[PDB]
Design a protein around this ligand. Structure first.
Ligand code: IIV
Ligand code: CL
Length: 130
C-alpha cells in the first residue's frame, strides 16, 4: 500500500541521516569509500563481502534495506571485515579495529536513542508479509 511505501521512505530517510552522521566523523574516514585495490591488492581476496559507508548509501537508495536490522547487518560487516583483515597487534591494525568498533557502537547508540521500537516492528511486519 501507499502507507507501507511511506513507512519504507521514512526508514530510508532515517538510515541516510544515521549514515551521514557516521560519514562526517573524522574517525571513520577510512570506512567512507571502498578499499582501493591498488594499495591493497589482497583485500578483495581476503574479504568476501567488502562494505563501506558509500556502499551503504547506495543500498539505501536502491531500497535494499527494509528494516533497521538489515542495515545493522551491513554496519556489523564494516566492523567484522576490519577485525578480520587487520588482526595484528601493531598500532596501525589496532587503530583500524578500534575505529571500526567505534563506528559500529556509534551506529547502535544512535539507533538505540532515536529509532522508535514500534517503527522497527512495523517495518519487520511489512517485510515478513512480502
Ligand atoms: C590497507 C590496510 O591494510 N588497511 C585498510 C583498512 C581496511 N581494513 O580496509 C585501510 O586503511 N584502507 C584501505 C587502504 C589503503 Br592505503
Ligand atoms: Cl589517521
Amino acid at each position: 500500500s501507499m502507507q507501507e511505501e511511506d513507512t519504507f521512505r521514512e526508514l530510508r530517510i532515517f538510515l541516510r541521516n544515521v549514515t551521514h552522521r557516521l560519514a562526517i566523523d573524522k574517525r571513520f574516514r577510512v570506512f567512507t569509500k571502498p578499499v582501493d585495490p591498488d594499495e591493497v591488492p589482497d583485500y578483495v581476496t581476503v574479504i568476501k563481502q567488502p562494505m563501506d559507508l558509500s556502499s551503504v548509501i547506495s543500498k539505501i537508495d536502491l531500497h535494499k534495506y527494509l528494516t533497521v536490522k538489515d542495515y545493522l547487518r551491513d554496519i556489523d560487516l564494516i566492523c567484522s571485515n576490519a577485525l578480520e583483515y587487520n588482526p595484528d597487534r601493531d598500532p596501525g591494525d589496532r587503530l583500524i579495529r578500534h575505529r571500526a568498533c567505534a563506528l559500529r557502537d556509534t551506529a547502535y547508540a544512535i539507533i538505540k536513542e532515536e529509532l522508535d521500537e514500534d517503527f522497527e516492528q512495523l517495518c519487520e511486519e511489512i517485510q515478513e508479509s512480502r
